[PDB]
Structure 1
Amino acid sequence: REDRFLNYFANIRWFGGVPLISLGKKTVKQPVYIVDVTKGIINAIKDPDARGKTFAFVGPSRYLLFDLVQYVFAVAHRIGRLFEISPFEPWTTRDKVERIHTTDKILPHLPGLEDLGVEATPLELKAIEVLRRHRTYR
């Protein structure tokens, strides 16, 4: 609901909506859903025998496309900061812009999520919830 990476998109009401960076090469990474994250911990908290055997979190099916950025504006139809405003909680034109566009689908020999089951969530069903813009009905 209230992460930074998916809310980095659609908070870009601007004089230009550019992807990163006008290219559909590496997009995207593996957006695992947040219920699967909290479900992996509670199974492992008395698993047993899960010490040292580090685990990896599978995402959805399967890699992902450039369509995601077009998927934002299609369906959206185009906490202790301060008393007034924080002076610097920016979009950070620095190494922030590259920490997500470096996908690295890593080694599948980690067990790491389906064995710490059961976590299976698509993207197309949970996308209605988090996105919220001016139409709200159609």
Structure 2
Amino acid sequence: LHHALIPHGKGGRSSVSGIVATVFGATGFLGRYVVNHLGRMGSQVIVPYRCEPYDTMHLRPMGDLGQIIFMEWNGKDKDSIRKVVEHSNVVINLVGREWETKNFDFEDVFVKIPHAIAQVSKEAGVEKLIHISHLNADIKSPSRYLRSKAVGEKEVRAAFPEATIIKPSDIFGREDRFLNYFASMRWFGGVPLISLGKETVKQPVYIVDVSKGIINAIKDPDAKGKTFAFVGPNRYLLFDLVQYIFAVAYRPFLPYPLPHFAYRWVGRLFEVSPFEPWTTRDKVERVHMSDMTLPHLPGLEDLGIQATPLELKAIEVLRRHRTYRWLTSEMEDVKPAKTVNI
């Protein structure tokens, strides 16, 4: 190790672990938790921020004095990357936009910048790189979410020989836009999902299990090159999500098997609001698509991180949606969803 890069301490806030994890685009969900994990044992996590410093302000408390070094950067600027990962001994990619922007074509958010940060990092002199792919990454799938993910996944794989690519499943957490999403059809309408849910089986994974995966991948030296898939403990047919989520929130269950034809129209109308595309045409077939088993690539279970069941922690995200009359209801009052899985 380098003269000062050598680790030291009991894993406290002011303990140097010697890992300099420059995370890319940490101002949302998984970025918030990984830096929380990254800053727990102490690490110079240089976070290149691009939004208003106010929205990045809440990353400060999870770092010791002189740890969360926010740095100005821009995606287009070639030198923007080279300055933020010059001294970072490890680089954790987290870039990507689940929704769409006119200036950010969906190809970019998973092909251009991920390739635009992988090659600079390898030119800088880094040791490792972790680009986050999707467990279902597949270009041939009609999902532009999947279509852009897969091509970018192999680009960083080709560009970076040691690119430890992570392919987590549909992660869930406090701001996952997956659980709080699936609670939102009650607000939006009569659950316009396709085929009443009996056409799609997914395997959600709790974010801390995911985030503990990367940091455990950091200490693991053999993780280089190997493409680990982060998978939840059990799968779940799509209908089971809808009834369970509407149960752990005490919402009026109004399911409706609206076919894919009319449900695709509401996607564009949700993008019509020129402030945030609540739901996109990509998100139309995103949930209809089911998760492939993908058994050959290693998982987090053999990496030392077990998987926490979804029904173990739902109201931790869903108590907010629980009305005043039923905000106090926990899992036990609610039946567990049918575990359609292995």
After TM superposition, is the score higher than 0.5? yes
Q: Distance in 2 between matches of 1:71 and 1:106?
A: 23
Counterpart residue number, 2:308: 121
Hey, what's the Cα distance between the residues in 1 that align with 2:284 and 2:314? 23
Structure whose CA Rg is larger: 2
Q: Does 1:42 align with 2:215?
A: yes
TM normalised by structure 2 equals 0.35
Provide the aligned length of Structure 1 versus Structure 2: 129
Which residue number corresponds to residue 328 of structure 2? Answer: 137
For 1:58 and 1:15, how far apart are their aligned partners in 2?
31
SS state of the match for residue 23, structure 1?
Answer: helix
Please tell me the residue identity of whatever aligns with 1:89: E
Amino acid across the alignment from 2:311: E
Pairwise mapping of residues 82-101 of structure 1 onto structure 2 (< 5 A)? Answer: 87-101=274-288
Asked if structure 2 preserves the Cα contact closer than 8 Å seen for 1:32 and 1:121, the reply is yes
Deviation digits for residues 1-36 of structure 1, max 9, x if unmatched? 101122211122134223x21333333311011111
Q: CA 1:71/1:4 → structure 2, altered by over 3 Å: closer, same or farther?
A: same
The runs of 5 or more residues in structure 1 that have no matched partner are 79-85
For structure 1, which segment, 46-55 or 6-15, has the greater mean C-alpha deviation from structure 2 after superposition? 6-15
Residue matched to 2:228: 55
Determine which of 236, 255, 259 is the counterpart of 1:64. Answer: 236
For 1:68, what is the secondary structure of its paired residue? Answer: helix
For 2:183, the aligned partner's letter is A
What is the Cα deviation at residue 67 of structure 1?
A: 1.6
RMSD, aligned α-carbons: 1.9
Q: Tell me what 2:199 maps to.
A: 26
Identity among equivalent positions (%) equals 79
Confirm or deny: 8 A CA contact 1:60 1:120 kept in the other structure.
yes
Is the Cα contact below 8 Å between 1:56 and 1:110 reproduced in 2? yes
Q: TM-score, length-normalised on structure 1?
A: 0.81
Of stretches 88-97 and 27-36 in structure 1, the one that deviates more from structure 2 is 88-97
The answer to whether the Cα contact below 8 Å between 1:26 and 1:101 also exists between their aligned partners in 2 is yes
Q: Say if 2:291 is the partner of 1:104.
A: yes
CA distance in 2, matches of 1:15, 1:100: 17
Displacement of 1:69 in angstroms is 0.1
Q: CA deviation at 1:100?
A: 2.6
Identify the residue that residue 81 of structure 1 maps to in structure 2.
none
Q: CA deviation at 1:106?
A: 3.5
In structure 2, the CA distance between the partners of 1:58 and 1:45, relative to structure 1 (3 Å rule), is: same
Normalized per residue, the structure richer in strand is 2
Q: Secondary structure at the match of 2:197?
A: coil
Q: CA deviation at 1:93?
A: 4.8
Shift in Å, 1:96: 1.5
Paired residue secondary structure (2:219)? coil
Instruction: Give the superposition deviation at 1:115.
Output: 1.7
Tell me which stretches of 4 or more aligned residues in structure 1 moved more than 6 Å. none
